[PDB]
Design an enzyme around this catalytic site. Structure first.
Site, mmCIF file in Angstrom:
data_model
loop_
_atom_site.group_PDB
_atom_site.id
_atom_site.type_symbol
_atom_site.label_atom_id
_atom_site.label_comp_id
_atom_site.label_asym_id
_atom_site.label_seq_id
_atom_site.Cartn_x
_atom_site.Cartn_y
_atom_site.Cartn_z
ATOM 1 N N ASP A 8 0.786 -1.242 0.000
ATOM 2 C CA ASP A 8 0.000 0.000 0.000
ATOM 3 C C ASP A 8 0.816 1.288 0.000
ATOM 4 O O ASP A 8 0.328 2.331 0.455
ATOM 5 C CB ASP A 8 -0.970 0.001 1.201
ATOM 6 C CG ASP A 8 -0.272 -0.246 2.528
ATOM 7 O OD1 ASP A 8 0.947 0.055 2.668
ATOM 8 O OD2 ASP A 8 -0.966 -0.734 3.460
ATOM 9 N N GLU A 53 -0.138 -9.062 -0.818
ATOM 10 C CA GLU A 53 -0.795 -8.403 0.326
ATOM 11 C C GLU A 53 -1.966 -7.529 -0.149
ATOM 12 O O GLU A 53 -2.024 -6.326 0.136
ATOM 13 C CB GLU A 53 0.190 -7.606 1.197
ATOM 14 C CG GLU A 53 -0.399 -7.236 2.555
ATOM 15 C CD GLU A 53 0.560 -6.407 3.379
ATOM 16 O OE1 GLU A 53 1.439 -6.998 4.036
ATOM 17 O OE2 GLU A 53 0.449 -5.162 3.355
ATOM 18 N N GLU A 59 -2.361 5.272 2.458
ATOM 19 C CA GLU A 59 -2.281 3.821 2.233
ATOM 20 C C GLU A 59 -3.610 3.158 1.908
ATOM 21 O O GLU A 59 -3.652 2.247 1.076
ATOM 22 C CB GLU A 59 -1.590 3.102 3.410
ATOM 23 C CG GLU A 59 -0.108 3.425 3.567
ATOM 24 C CD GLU A 59 0.173 4.710 4.340
ATOM 25 O OE1 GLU A 59 -0.767 5.443 4.739
ATOM 26 O OE2 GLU A 59 1.363 5.011 4.533
ATOM 27 N N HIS A 100 5.500 6.186 12.932
ATOM 28 C CA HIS A 100 5.749 6.942 11.676
ATOM 29 C C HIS A 100 4.577 7.211 10.760
ATOM 30 O O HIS A 100 4.795 7.744 9.658
ATOM 31 C CB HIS A 100 6.864 6.267 10.854
ATOM 32 C CG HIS A 100 6.444 4.956 10.237
ATOM 33 N ND1 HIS A 100 5.956 4.854 8.975
ATOM 34 C CD2 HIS A 100 6.434 3.676 10.770
ATOM 35 C CE1 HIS A 100 5.643 3.560 8.725
ATOM 36 N NE2 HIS A 100 5.941 2.842 9.828
ATOM 37 N N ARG A 118 1.755 8.714 8.549
ATOM 38 C CA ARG A 118 1.631 10.095 8.041
ATOM 39 C C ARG A 118 0.545 10.898 8.768
ATOM 40 O O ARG A 118 0.757 12.068 9.116
ATOM 41 C CB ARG A 118 1.344 10.052 6.534
ATOM 42 C CG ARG A 118 1.542 11.368 5.774
ATOM 43 C CD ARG A 118 1.443 11.110 4.267
ATOM 44 N NE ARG A 118 2.450 10.130 3.863
ATOM 45 C CZ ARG A 118 3.630 10.408 3.319
ATOM 46 N NH1 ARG A 118 3.967 11.663 3.036
ATOM 47 N NH2 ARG A 118 4.485 9.413 3.055
ATOM 48 N N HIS A 170 12.562 6.203 12.820
ATOM 49 C CA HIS A 170 12.426 6.387 11.365
ATOM 50 C C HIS A 170 13.257 7.559 10.884
ATOM 51 O O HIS A 170 13.434 8.552 11.603
ATOM 52 C CB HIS A 170 10.947 6.619 11.064
ATOM 53 C CG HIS A 170 10.566 6.433 9.615
ATOM 54 N ND1 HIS A 170 10.840 7.354 8.670
ATOM 55 C CD2 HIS A 170 9.868 5.417 8.981
ATOM 56 C CE1 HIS A 170 10.372 6.934 7.485
ATOM 57 N NE2 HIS A 170 9.769 5.752 7.675
HETATM 58 C C1 LIG Z 1 2.906 6.971 1.057
HETATM 59 C C2 LIG Z 1 3.952 5.933 1.329
HETATM 60 O O1 LIG Z 1 4.403 5.231 0.430
HETATM 61 N N1 LIG Z 1 4.328 5.848 2.608
HETATM 62 C C3 LIG Z 1 5.163 4.756 3.077
HETATM 63 C C4 LIG Z 1 6.501 5.314 3.547
HETATM 64 O O2 LIG Z 1 6.273 6.345 4.500
HETATM 65 P P1 LIG Z 1 7.444 7.363 4.934
HETATM 66 O O3 LIG Z 1 6.880 8.123 6.094
HETATM 67 O O4 LIG Z 1 8.753 6.665 5.060
HETATM 68 O O5 LIG Z 1 7.457 8.408 3.686
HETATM 69 P P2 LIG Z 1 8.615 8.524 2.558
HETATM 70 O O6 LIG Z 1 8.900 7.189 1.928
HETATM 71 O O7 LIG Z 1 8.156 9.647 1.668
HETATM 72 O O8 LIG Z 1 9.913 9.062 3.313
HETATM 73 C C5 LIG Z 1 9.774 10.290 4.028
HETATM 74 C C6 LIG Z 1 11.111 10.984 4.238
HETATM 75 O O9 LIG Z 1 11.902 10.259 5.198
HETATM 76 C C7 LIG Z 1 13.294 10.385 4.870
HETATM 77 N N2 LIG Z 1 13.882 9.059 4.583
HETATM 78 C C8 LIG Z 1 13.106 7.956 4.411
HETATM 79 C C9 LIG Z 1 13.689 6.718 4.134
HETATM 80 C C10 LIG Z 1 15.086 6.639 4.025
HETATM 81 O O10 LIG Z 1 15.637 5.543 3.772
HETATM 82 N N3 LIG Z 1 15.845 7.743 4.186
HETATM 83 C C11 LIG Z 1 15.285 8.935 4.459
HETATM 84 O O11 LIG Z 1 16.007 9.951 4.616
HETATM 85 C C12 LIG Z 1 13.345 11.296 3.637
HETATM 86 O O12 LIG Z 1 13.477 12.676 4.070
HETATM 87 C C13 LIG Z 1 11.985 11.062 2.996
HETATM 88 O O13 LIG Z 1 11.557 12.100 2.101
HETATM 89 O O14 LIG Z 1 7.309 4.269 4.123
HETATM 90 C C14 LIG Z 1 6.699 3.679 5.287
HETATM 91 C C15 LIG Z 1 7.656 2.633 5.867
HETATM 92 O O15 LIG Z 1 8.632 3.217 6.742
HETATM 93 C C16 LIG Z 1 5.378 3.018 4.902
HETATM 94 O O16 LIG Z 1 4.709 2.554 6.090
HETATM 95 C C17 LIG Z 1 4.447 4.021 4.217
HETATM 96 O O17 LIG Z 1 3.288 3.330 3.712
HETATM 97 O O1 LIG Z 2 13.798 -0.568 13.185
HETATM 98 C C1 LIG Z 2 13.065 -1.357 12.548
HETATM 99 C C2 LIG Z 2 11.683 -1.170 12.561
HETATM 100 C C3 LIG Z 2 10.875 -2.052 11.853
HETATM 101 N N1 LIG Z 2 11.431 -3.074 11.183
HETATM 102 C C4 LIG Z 2 10.594 -3.975 10.382
HETATM 103 O O2 LIG Z 2 9.991 -3.152 9.358
HETATM 104 C C5 LIG Z 2 8.775 -3.780 8.925
HETATM 105 C C6 LIG Z 2 7.624 -2.786 8.944
HETATM 106 O O3 LIG Z 2 8.066 -1.584 8.308
HETATM 107 P P1 LIG Z 2 7.501 -0.142 8.754
HETATM 108 O O4 LIG Z 2 6.947 -0.148 10.153
HETATM 109 O O5 LIG Z 2 8.543 0.861 8.379
HETATM 110 O O6 LIG Z 2 6.259 0.129 7.748
HETATM 111 P P2 LIG Z 2 4.715 -0.376 7.704
HETATM 112 O O7 LIG Z 2 4.726 -1.855 8.010
HETATM 113 O O8 LIG Z 2 3.961 0.457 8.737
HETATM 114 O O9 LIG Z 2 4.355 -0.026 6.255
HETATM 115 C C7 LIG Z 2 8.513 -4.929 9.876
HETATM 116 O O10 LIG Z 2 8.891 -6.120 9.178
HETATM 117 C C8 LIG Z 2 9.421 -4.649 11.073
HETATM 118 O O11 LIG Z 2 9.836 -5.838 11.763
HETATM 119 C C9 LIG Z 2 12.835 -3.219 11.147
HETATM 120 O O12 LIG Z 2 13.349 -4.157 10.500
HETATM 121 N N2 LIG Z 2 13.618 -2.367 11.845
#
Ligand SMILES: CC(=O)N[C@H]1[C@@H](OP(=O)(O)OP(=O)(O)OC[C@H]2O[C@@H](n3ccc(=O)[nH]c3=O)[C@H](O)[C@@H]2O)O[C@H](CO)[C@@H](O)[C@@H]1O
Ligand SMILES: O=c1ccn([C@@H]2O[C@H](COP(=O)(O)OP(=O)(O)O)[C@@H](O)[C@H]2O)c(=O)[nH]1
Ligand SMILES: CC(=O)N[C@H]1[C@@H](OP(=O)(O)OP(=O)(O)OC[C@H]2O[C@@H](n3ccc(=O)[nH]c3=O)[C@H](O)[C@@H]2O)O[C@H](CO)[C@@H](O)[C@@H]1O
Ligand SMILES: O=c1ccn([C@@H]2O[C@H](COP(=O)(O)OP(=O)(O)O)[C@@H](O)[C@H]2O)c(=O)[nH]1
Lengths: 376, 384
Positions: B97, B119, B133, B206, B208, B239
């Site tokens: 998602d 999924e 999502e 984390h 949104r 995060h």
């Molecule tokens: C809309 C969407 O697809 N959201 C997904 C995204 O949210 P998430 O909150 O991570 O949103 P983004 O993927 O846009 O990342 C947000 C911001 O975090 C920072 N950033 C993120 C990752 C990284 O490796 N390095 C870094 O610096 C960047 O500034 C980036 O722009 O990832 C989450 C997992 O964690 C998922 O649960 C969410 O479904």
């Molecule tokens: O520090 C962390 C936090 C989470 N996870 C794993 O990340 C996955 C879930 O990802 P996240 O919570 O970022 O996103 P969501 O599942 O909410 O999309 C799960 O398998 C967790 O066990 C991880 O490996 N390290």
């Protein structure tokens, strides 16, 4: 406080169907309305805006020549997103099933702006026919908070997808609002003059899934009809898509009895349709207009999402096989029983009050009116 | 000829859940498989790929700092569109998602490439919870040709939306495929050494829709719990979202008993979960993992699309109100009857064979196998 409503649209057909609504919205003191065009179409959109004397508040001018689906989607999304950073309406109204419809809905959603979908719920069930319109309308339906379905069958389609009944209103199609004003008893045109006493077949063809071989098949069938029936002429207002124009020129260049013309202003087109013997089309909007005119239509598609016109006898699916189209056109030319069956006028798509119903539903929903309007 | 299958994903959770499927696909000589990452996440994606030893064929490197939804969507769509001009798999597999999931599906559709949704079918019915999502998975569902639902209720969600029954397969969740290999007997970590004998609460946050006020409410409650209970310590792998980091620093930056650490590798995270007293999270994936571990979870959301975990007693929706979170966490620390009710292990989300079912379903669908694999069997079917 005044309800802030923004219409978002970008193409000829959306503009024709949205213009009556844009004009209706302005009549209500409790509404502050804005008009935004993506200009996914440029010339073909401006033709409509100029005819209705509508000037958009915002014009994003996105059209690129021979643009791809990805390009329209990205350009519309990025520009609308930029717009929504500065202007925040209460509700965005989108239309039908273009890439602008979907991108507009998605951009609004990303800003948590409510979405109303005009002409909601049409389906063929086939993700590649029409392509990408079937998925555009389905994905827009996922986003939309309010669904303005033209007919009961469109509402039923949304119900089958688990949409809440109380979020869907049956308004009729706003196309009929416009159509009910354009036909002229005394209509004249230089092209009709040279057609004279001959039977006139009105042709349009532009579906994405019909480009290439299917459209060649259509045009070959048309050439065969013209060659065989001396007292028949074809008028073809050719879409601006250069792929269509190439095919049109290839088959109908050097034809005396097929008239390749620039797209007609809507008043002119409606009047050509009224004067025609019958219509060959793969247009969506033309299918909804024909029953009111009592004009037989051979639909040059393998599917339609206008079953109401099929039930009325006006619309017949011809597919895209050369021989099939030839045989069906020949039948309409030579069988008075079949022609009569297909030429009874009815109004399954609207009564001309769709724009009023949409605005009155909005006002009820947001608490400006205590009563809901009638349904179509 | 070989079936050409391409996986498309770009974030940490997708990578964890897709890694077992990537590896399973490589086992079958009938399949020519490709791995495409959008790198919507950069560092957090690379952590997963390096752990599973997966080297993508294509890496679109889209991540921008503090990127918006429109940015991710545009960047992913444009780059995937360009890729599909040159390479045409028979089917594209997307996960879950994320905006990558949706953009991947859309790009494939624009090229008339078939789409399988791993999924598929999770729903809250609330378009702003989770945001975006809920709509990402709904729109992906409109495009998808094949739907790999983790559970019966996810299949039922799709059926209610007028999806054809013969296009939906109940596979279990691939998360369990990964989880079944990670927890080891004598696990140790420097952070766990610091915790020592104390009760550990494992925290991640984390979502949104939770950014800003809701998250601050969570963190205020958690800070109060740490203050009040001297034998409690929190471990929080934070995060990389700068917005989350600001909130974590604001509320926990001065606490000796809240360990603000970099995101943990999945092996380490799973083992921390196994050792925790309970979990506070708004993660999707952690909700699916916890029942297997018998670990109570307070879900820091107003909704969940993991109802099986709620029915198992493992997951309890806490919302985002400060006082409610405080009261529910205090209950877990002080009420042995409630702790017991929430700590019974079960496996409602899978048996570790989801990836195999997905691959075997693909092979059956395309004519490589005469037999279709049996579906993942849940709750009621065991027992009845
Ligand atoms: C809309 C969407 O697809 N959201 C997904 C995204 O949210 P998430 O909150 O991570 O949103 P983004 O993927 O846009 O990342 C947000 C911001 O975090 C920072 N950033 C993120 C990752 C990284 O490796 N390095 C870094 O610096 C960047 O500034 C980036 O722009 O990832 C989450 C997992 O964690 C998922 O649960 C969410 O479904
Ligand atoms: O520090 C962390 C936090 C989470 N996870 C794993 O990340 C996955 C879930 O990802 P996240 O919570 O970022 O996103 P969501 O599942 O909410 O999309 C799960 O398998 C967790 O066990 C991880 O490996 N390290
Ligand atoms: C996916 C999508 O949204 N398709 C819509 C679009 O298809 P249509 O086939 O018009 O597709 P586009 O809007 O992308 O336009 C195609 C191409 O035609 C040329 N062009 C078009 C318009 C114009 O005013 N000037 C011009 O030059 C351009 O080269 C353009 O790139 O409009 C049709 C109305 O006619 C609608 O039925 C279709 O649902
Ligand atoms: O030369 C033309 C051809 C069509 N139309 C009108 O354009 C609308 C249909 O648009 P189009 O066929 O381009 O798109 P579709 O309806 O298939 O999306 C209908 O109202 C037609 O009456 C027009 O005004 N001039």
């Amino acid at each position: 406080k005044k309800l802030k409503v923004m219409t978002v649209f970008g193409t000829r057909p959306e503009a024709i169907k949205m213009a009556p609504l844009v004009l209706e919205l302005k009549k209500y003191p409790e509404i502050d309305s804005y008009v935004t065009v993506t200009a996914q179409h440029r010339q073909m959109l401006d033709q409509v805006l100029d005819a209705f004397h509508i000037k958009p508040d915002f014009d994003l001018n996105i059209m690129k020549e021979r643009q791809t689906l990805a390009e329209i989607t990205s350009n519309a999304l990025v520009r609308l997103d930029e717009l929504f950073k500065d202007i925040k309406p209460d509700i965005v109204l989108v239309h039908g099933d273009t890439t602008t419809t979907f991108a507009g809905s998605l951009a609004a959603f990303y800003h948590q702006i409510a979405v109303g979908h005009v002409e909601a719920g049409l389906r063929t069930g086939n993700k590649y026919s029409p392509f990408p319109e079937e998925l555009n309308r389905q994905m827009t339906g996922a986003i939309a908070d309010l669904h303005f379905a033209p007919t009961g069958q469109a509402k039923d389609n949304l119900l089958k997808e688990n949409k809440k009944a109380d979020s869907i209103f049956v308004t009729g199609n706003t196309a009929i609002d416009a159509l009910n004003t354009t036909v002229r008893d005394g209509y004249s045109h230089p092209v009709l003059d040279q057609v004279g006493e001959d039977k006139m077949i009105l042709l349009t063809a532009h579906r994405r899934e019909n480009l290439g071989e299917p459209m060649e098949n259509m045009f070959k069938a048309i050439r065969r009809i013209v060659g065989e029936f001396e007292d028949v002429q074809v008028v073809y207002p050719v879409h601006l898509n250069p792929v269509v124009r190439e095919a049109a020129h290839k088959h109908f260049g050097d034809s005396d009895r097929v008239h390749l013309i620039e797209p007609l202003e809507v008043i002119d087109f409606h009047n050509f349709a009224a004067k025609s013997h019958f219509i060959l089309t793969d247009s969506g909007g033309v299918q909804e207009e024909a029953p009111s005119l009592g004009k037989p239509v051979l639909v040059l598609r393998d599917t339609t999402e206008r079953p109401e016109g099929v039930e009325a006898g006006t619309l017949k699916l011809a597919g895209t096989d050369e021989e099939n189209i030839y045989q069906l056109a020949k039948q309409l030319l030579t069988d008075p029983d079949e022609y009569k069956k297909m030429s009874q006028a009815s109004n399954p798509y609207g009564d001309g009050e769709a724009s009023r119903r949409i605005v009155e539903e909005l006002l009820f929903h947001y608490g400006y009116r205590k009563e809901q309007p009638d349904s179509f």
